[PDB]
Symmetry: C2
Subunit: 123 residues, 2 copies
């Protein structure tokens, strides 16, 4: 795998790792200019984004990835796509799709753009 | 609508008009560094993208957008997300998801990163 795939796959892994153990720690991977579109709702900046994710009414959450793709961009960013399922407490299993735009700032890969959508009908 | 939504939306609309009515003209929206991932397979560079699009086995296709989201990025690009359905010739209706990274180059909006995937779930 090319370097953008190694970085992206690793960022994806670390992201869900954090999200699934303590989403209040996701601030380390967003910056003030970060944009998040979560089920059509928009949020900008590390504070507002973490607040939104933290507000999700779940105690236990687990992401399982069924597919991911990564590409390099001309401004040296990495764009990543992920599809999978999520198990939050006793809720029925739900499919999700997520997109990330990554940029290296201050020698750290951060997410500048995040778009998340859930499957309307699940098995 | 914010400017990034107006531009992303018109680009999306244009891309599908081209795809559904004259796909041989799709190369015009890409540049040499553009990258495409088609149903999980990678085509890096305009030449490979163009050849792959030219190879599509369908004679006629129709796309219908059901949802879209757009965001501005720090380097002034626009990241777009499209959810919809598509029907090719006699194949059954299928769900799809597509992501586009847009950048104004030589003062024209072009797509630098394109990720297309068929979808079994309705996002």
């Amino acid at each position: 795998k090319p370097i953008w795939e190694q970085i992206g796959s690793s960022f994806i892994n670390h992201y869900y790792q954090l999200f699934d153990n303590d989403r209040t720690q996701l601030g380390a991977i967003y910056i003030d200019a970060s944009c998040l579109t979560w089920e059509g709702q928009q949020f900008q900046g590390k504070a507002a984004i973490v607040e939104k994710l933290s507000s999700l009414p779940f105690q236990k959450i687990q992401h399982s990835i069924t597919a991911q793709d990564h590409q390099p961009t001309p401004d040296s960013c990495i764009i990543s796509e992920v599809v999978g399922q999520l198990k939050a407490d006793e809720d029925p299993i739900m499919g999700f799709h997520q997109m990330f735009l990554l940029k290296n700032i201050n020698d750290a890969w951060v997410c500048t753009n995040d778009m998340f959508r859930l499957a309307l009908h699940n098995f």
